[PDB]
């Protein structure tokens, strides 16, 4: 019914009120100390006071680091922005990697503003233009002003327009008898559709039909809106939504990331500080998750060394599989987890332990219950032995072919013959490696 | 169309019990790999499982790409199958992660339901009011069948579609209201007043009967990447064809994910998954492997099929060697289907299937020598030699292809080992690796 | 005689649930036990308000980008509307910079050096470089030798707007490429022709994919005008900025002329058609849905926002043939939502809180909503997911000699705990 994909079983960190964790709750099994550390981190995050904090989720492969990051995001909520990332995603061909990292830093910080909108909406009853006395004078436009008549429900008003607002009106291609929506904040117009008071069974353009808008014209309504600071930086660097010629030409041109200067970010900070001082906007700091942080070179770590010192920079969590591994982009500097020792001092390493046999067994059982598979006890034990023998992920990813073989053999339960056939058909890494070492023609 | 190297596969050749026949649907042998590919096919057809990587491995000239195209033919209609190679990821305007994400979002599909009105009748009159400069276009249409006659108002796009495919009165046209199609089925009046300018000779059609407007419901398939380019900029439809989709932002992706979830919950749209096939996967970089590792674990992620013919070799972008050229963390997430080399009977059956497809008739002894040559050097060499033996036979003005023809073809065209033995004996003739050569005869 | 229906949770419902779960916290298991036994009670009512309808929490108004604008706002015959949007970021430049480096002055050399670099030392100047102009007039085939000097000294977008040229010398080196021949063929050509249909496949893909009726998925989050430059004490800056932002040639180019103004211009004032300023050069958007970033709240989407409401509307679709009544129960403010629902989309006979006996005498009417003897009703539809079965018994004290109880329930919430206990 519902599409499952990878660690969908996680519903949260599964902690208690005192700050402790139960063994099997919240979709997790084990890793009690890592769970409690991430709970203290998410409490620090909800405190909304510190900036430029960083932790590291260290450990081997297939150990639960990305699971812990997803659990943190689910414990945080939708209003707090979670910005997932991979280390390889910072290498863009349009713009330097430093600006991509700073754009992600600004993308993590959220904002929630209540906004007041001045709205003229209604049905266009009349629409007359007034020409100029010298239409080919070269200066000014071919019309002078335009009178338009809008009636909402239980109201009627006549509007006299300057040529720019009517230029937007005719760019949205209104006609007599259409329901329109003038936003006086930007001059943007939205054509709602034909009024349904007239006959609605004769058009040939699949037009929607809408009743009269309730209330008077010249409404003033309050909208709550959730935006990030990166949205403000992008919207000011590529200005669209105005009605001048720069905003009109900005829509049609090809978008391209540019190195946003520090002056724009400082001006956006001053404006958001004014919005906060007005009491209309609140600051919501969030997270940024660089999975596979070993993929970054030394230059991104050098820029992080300064970008964590900002007064607005969020809390950033990292993951790494490496042990004593040389840093990418350097020649002889060998460091733990592929992370240079300057960044390790700002970091707070959260270790993550490997699993046991029974923990693997209950993880496989929970994955079978998530995927709506029914498994007998003997096949579950055999899959647990296979997990401890080959790998955990090879045991988790073998449940689906046993399900396919089960519905092939007109059964729902997974017998031992099904997991034996799935062992035969699909190989793990080690058996395929032994096949590689015992072949001549580079199989 | 033309005939290609994998044209003989017309499916995968398995039963309802997922048991392969010895030779069915143009495929022979490879029983375990065929059964495993059928299992992965049924797992795709279920659709509730997402982001599972399947790695096909074996020696060259075995049928890994043949197995992949067999899965593609058995995949059915309206299911995406993005078949790229390893080197399309590297680009000058796209990042590697962005090109991979574009491939991933091409491979997954959305089936959208729409409501459509069908109008078909004779045209009584057309009145079109265009402005002085021709910009604003508005007017009325009066279409008619034998039971009732209705008048519609026209918009700009319908009138512009009316100007092309010029519609005189008394022309039976079909109007699709949603798609905006105009289909002149013919002319039904055949008026005596005929214009000497116009050269149309549209066929006479019967007057339509029944009601004028007919409601129908249609379904069409569009991938996630197409809607991403469409919503990315104003002229996204042109960038769908010219490929000028330069690094679409993440906000667009988040909003289209929420939107297609909303369309799923309304019953309007249905999300079907697909198979993303990479050929020569070892050509990728290590950062591509890390992004594949962290992008298989997403809700919208297809069943990635991965093919390599390489043993333990150096992984690109790194200084070490790894099995299949793939690092161990990607091999952890991937289940490996292995393939095995053929015997003389399977090679004979392959060559017989190839000759039966390629419209070439062979004798028994020519087939035996082709089987022996195929089991000697390579299967692809004999499969290529069928063509030149056919052409030599038609140059000798005989319908069949004889043993002498394939012997002349074997003498005429060289294979790998013979060309190696001819290079090694004449090392002064060709340019060496140090760039030293003797072009003079003496 | 006994029906209990169960509904899942939509995405907006799940989003509101998960933000309430993360924000309030306060032992959600103990909050579940609080909803079992019945501030804590304010949390339980607000969780139930999330469970019933998103619009019972907050009304979903228009989805528009954040207007990063400062403008003329009312603090509260015609009232004229004038465009006044400005960027709140104001870049301040002193007058010394503008009047000394940008404008002409007696002690400045900007006009002199500008003429000397643009006209006097231009290589396309026919007065001093006639041989090069004649060379390029042989190559390109321009009929006028001043075309090269005019082209090299115009802004490029103004060159785009003023480009309409049809005479060309036939004894020139400018060529008609095979692609240009094919483009001149498919300038105007109908269907059923091979040479046009092999080159019009973009329109075939547009037509066959039903792509003119795909809804908009993405809108920008913040829309902002260009950064306003403010120079204190000079009106020349204001006039120059007003000229740059609102250039009449270019603003006339991206727009259209009203048809009445075209008729009054061409016929009444005798302006020839070629003398009109160029119009209609704005690119056509993909559908009508992609015309603007403001999205109107679809009333069709209001049904699908709440899963209980969607199942109820499906149930009414099945049950229009028979007469029943509906209980909205203990929740306030759900009345006006359901009221607006059936008087906005699907108009039904109804009565909402004598006239009770007046509907009891009327068989064809469906009662719909009531709050918390009525045996004339044939079927009561209600929730049964209430803490007090005494409230249930008082509700079914109302109760035609038939009952068919349908019980509305949402899964994956505190409602299931309520039902179990």
């Amino acid at each position: 019914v519902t599409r499952t994909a990878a660690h969908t079983h996680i519903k949260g960190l599964g902690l208690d009120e005192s700050g402790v964790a139960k063994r099997v709750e919240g979709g997790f099994v084990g890793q009690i100390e890592a769970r409690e550390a991430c709970g203290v981190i998410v409490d620090l995050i909800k405190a909304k006071k510190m900036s430029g904090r960083a932790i590291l989720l260290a450990g081997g492969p297939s150990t639960g680091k990305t699971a812990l990051a997803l659990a943190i995001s689910q414990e945080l909520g939708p209003k707090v922005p979670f910005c997932p990332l991979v280390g390889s995603e910072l290498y863009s061909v349009e713009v330097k990697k430093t600006e991509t990292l700073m754009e992600n830093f600004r993308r993590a910080i959220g904002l929630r503003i209540k906004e007041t909108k001045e709205v003229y909406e209604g049905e266009v009853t009349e629409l007359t233009p007034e020409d100029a006395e010298n239409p080919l004078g070269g200066y000014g436009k071919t019309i002078s002003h335009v009178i338009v008549g809008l009636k909402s429900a239980k109201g009627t008003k006549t509007l006299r327009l300057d040529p720019t607002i009517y230029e937007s009106i005719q760019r949205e291609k209104v006609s007599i008898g259409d329901v329109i929506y003038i936003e006086a904040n930007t001059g943007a117009v939205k054509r709602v559709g034909r009024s349904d008071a007239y006959a609605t069974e004769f058009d040939l353009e699949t037009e929607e039909y809408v009743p009269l808008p309730k209330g008077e014209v010249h409404k003033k309504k309050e909208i709550v809106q959730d935006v990030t600071l990166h949205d403000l930086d992008v919207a000011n660097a590529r200005p669209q939504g105005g009605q001048d010629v720069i905003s009109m030409m900005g829509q049609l041109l090809k978008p391209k990331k540019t190195e946003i200067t520090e002056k724009l970010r400082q001006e956006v900070n001053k404006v958001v500080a004014k919005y906060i001082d007005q009491g209309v906007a609140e600051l919501i700091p969030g997270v940024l998750f660089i999975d596979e942080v070993n993929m970054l070179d030394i230059e991104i770590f050098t820029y992080l060394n300064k970008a964590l010192e900002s007064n607005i920079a969020p809390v950033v969590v990292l993951a790494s599989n490496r042990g004593m591994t040389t840093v990418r982009g350097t020649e002889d500097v060998i460091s733990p987890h592929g992370v240079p020792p300057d960044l390790i001092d700002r970091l707070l390493i959260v270790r993550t332990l490997p699993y046991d046999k029974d923990e693997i067994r209950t993880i496989i059982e929970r994955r079978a219950t998530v995927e709506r598979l029914q498994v007998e006890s003997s096949a579950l034990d055999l899959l647990a032995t296979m997990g401890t023998e080959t790998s955990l992920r090879y045991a988790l990813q073998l449940l689906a072919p046993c399900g396919i073989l089960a519905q092939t053999s007109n059964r729902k339960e997974i017998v031992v013959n099904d997991v034996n056939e799935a062992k035969l058909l699909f190989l793990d890494a080690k058996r395929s490696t032994k096949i590689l070492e015992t072949s001549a023609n580079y199989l | 169309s033309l005939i290609a190297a994998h044209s003989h596969i017309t499916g995968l050749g398995l039963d309802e019990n997922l048991q392969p026949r010895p030779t069915s649907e143009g495929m022979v042998g490879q029983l375990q790999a065929r059964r495993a590919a059928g299992v992965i096919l049924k797992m795709v057809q279920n659709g509730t499982i997402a982001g599972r990587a399947v790695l096909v491995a074996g020696p060259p000239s075995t049928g890994k790409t043949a197995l992949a195209m067999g899965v593609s033919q058995s995949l059915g209609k309206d299911v995406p199958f993005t078949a790229i190679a390893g080197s399309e990821i590297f680009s000058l305007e796209l990042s590697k992660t962005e090109a991979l994400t574009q491939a991933f979002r091409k491979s997954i599909g959305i089936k959208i339901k729409e409501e459509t009105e069908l109008i078909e009748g004779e045209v009584v009159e057309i009145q079109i009011d265009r402005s002085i400069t021709g910009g604003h276009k508005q007017g009325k249409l009066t279409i008619k069948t034998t039971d009732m006659e209705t008048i519609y108002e026209l918009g700009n796009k319908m009138i512009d579609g009316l100007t092309k495919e010029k519609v005189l009165a008394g022309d039976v046209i079909s109007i699709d209201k949603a798609s905006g199609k105009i289909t002149k089925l013919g002319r039904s009046f055949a008026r005596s007043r005929d214009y000497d300018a116009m050269g149309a000779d549209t066929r006479f059609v019967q007057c339509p009967e029944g009601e004028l407007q007919k409601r129908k419901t249609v379904v069409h398939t569009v991938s996630l990447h197409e809607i991403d380019v469409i919503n990315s900029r104003t002229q996204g439809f042109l960038a769908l064809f010219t490929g000028d989709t330069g690094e679409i932002r993440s906000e667009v992706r988040d909003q289209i994910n929420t939107k297609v979830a909303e369309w799923k919950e309304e019953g309007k749209a249905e999300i079907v998954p697909g198979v993303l096939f990479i050929d020569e996967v070892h050509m990728l970089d290590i950062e591509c492997f890390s992004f594949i590792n962290r992008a298989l674990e997403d809700e919208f992620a297809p069943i990635v099929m991965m093919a390599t013919n390489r043993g333990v070799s150096k992984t690109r972008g790194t200084n070490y060697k790894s099995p299949h050229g793939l690092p161990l963390d990607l091999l952890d997430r991937s289940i490996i289907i292995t393939t095995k080399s053929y015997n003389e009977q399977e090679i004979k059956t392959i060559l017989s299937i190839r000759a039966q497809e390629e419209e070439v008739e062979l004798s028994s002894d020519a087939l035996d020598l082709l089987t022996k040559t195929g089991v000697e050097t390579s299967l692809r060499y004999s499969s290529n030699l069928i063509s030149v033996a056919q052409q030599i036979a038609m140059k000798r003005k005989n319908n069949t292809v004889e043993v002498e023809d394939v012997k002349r073809a074997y003498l005429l065209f060289l294979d790998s080992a013979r060309s190696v033995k001819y290079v090694q004996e004449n090392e002064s003739q060709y340019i060496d690796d140090q760039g030293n050569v003797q072009i003079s005869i003496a | 005689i006994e029906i209990d229906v169960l509904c899942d949770l939509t995405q907006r419902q799940a989003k509101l649930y998960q933000v309430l779960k993360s924000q309030i916290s306060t032992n959600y298991d103990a909050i579940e036990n609080a909803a079992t036994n019945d501030n804590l009670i304010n949390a339980v009512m607000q969780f139930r308000k999330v469970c019933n309808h998103p619009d019972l929490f907050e009304r979903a108004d228009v989805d528009s980008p954040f207007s990063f604008t400062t403008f003329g706002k009312t603090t509260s015959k015609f009232t004229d509307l004038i465009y006044s949007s400005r960027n709140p970021i104001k870049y301040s430049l002193p007058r010394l910079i503008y009047e000394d480096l940008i404008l002409p002055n007696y002690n400045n050399d900007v006009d002199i050096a500008n003429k000397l670099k643009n006209v006097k030392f231009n290589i396309f100047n026919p007065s001093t470089n006639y041989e090069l102009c004649l060379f390029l007039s042989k190559l390109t085939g321009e009929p006028s030798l001043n075309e090269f000097f005019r082209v090299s000294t115009t802004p490029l977008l103004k060159r785009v707007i003023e480009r309409t040229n049809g005479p060309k010398n036939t004894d020139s080196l400018s060529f008609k490429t095979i692609t240009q021949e094919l483009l001149e063929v498919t300038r105007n050509a109908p269907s059923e022709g091979v040479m046009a249909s092999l080159l019009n496949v973009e329109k075939h893909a547009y037509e066959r994919e039903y792509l003119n009726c795909i809804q908009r998925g993405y809108h920008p989050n913040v829309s902002a005008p260009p950064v306003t430059i403010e120079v204190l004490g000079s009106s020349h800056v204001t006039n120059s900025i007003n000229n740059e932002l609102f250039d009449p040639l270019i603003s006339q180019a991206l727009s259209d002329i009203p048809a009445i103004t075209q008729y009054n211009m061409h016929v009444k004032k005798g302006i020839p058609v070629e003398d009109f300023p160029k119009t209609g050069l704005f690119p056509e958007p993909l559908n009508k849905n992609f015309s603007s970033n403001i999205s109107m709240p679809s009333m069709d989407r209001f049904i699908t926002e709440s899963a209980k409401l969607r199942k109820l509307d499906e149930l009414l679709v099945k049950l229009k043939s028979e007469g029943h009544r509906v209980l909205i129960y203990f929740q306030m403010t759900k009345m006006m939502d359901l009221m607006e629902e059936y008087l906005t989309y699907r108009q039904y006979n109804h009565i909402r809180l004598d006239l009770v006996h007046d509907w009891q005498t009327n068989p064809e009417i469906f009662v719909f909503l009531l709050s918390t003897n009525l045996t004339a009703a044939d079927t009561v539809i209600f929730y049964d997911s209430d803490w007090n079965p005494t409230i249930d018994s008082q509700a079914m004290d109302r109760a035609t000699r038939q009952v068919t109880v349908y019980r509305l329930l949402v899964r994956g919430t505190i409602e299931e705990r309520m039902r179990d206990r």
Partner: peptide, 28 residues
């Protein structure tokens, strides 16, 4: 009852008219 048709404004523009018998073009 039956709803009225939308008001069709045809002032100020040329007319191309095609009918069953013969074709017209009223221009300005």
């Amino acid at each position: 009852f039956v709803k009225p048709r939308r008001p069709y404004n045809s002032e100020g523009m040329t007319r191309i008219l095609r009918r069953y018998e013969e074709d017209l073009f009223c221009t300005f």
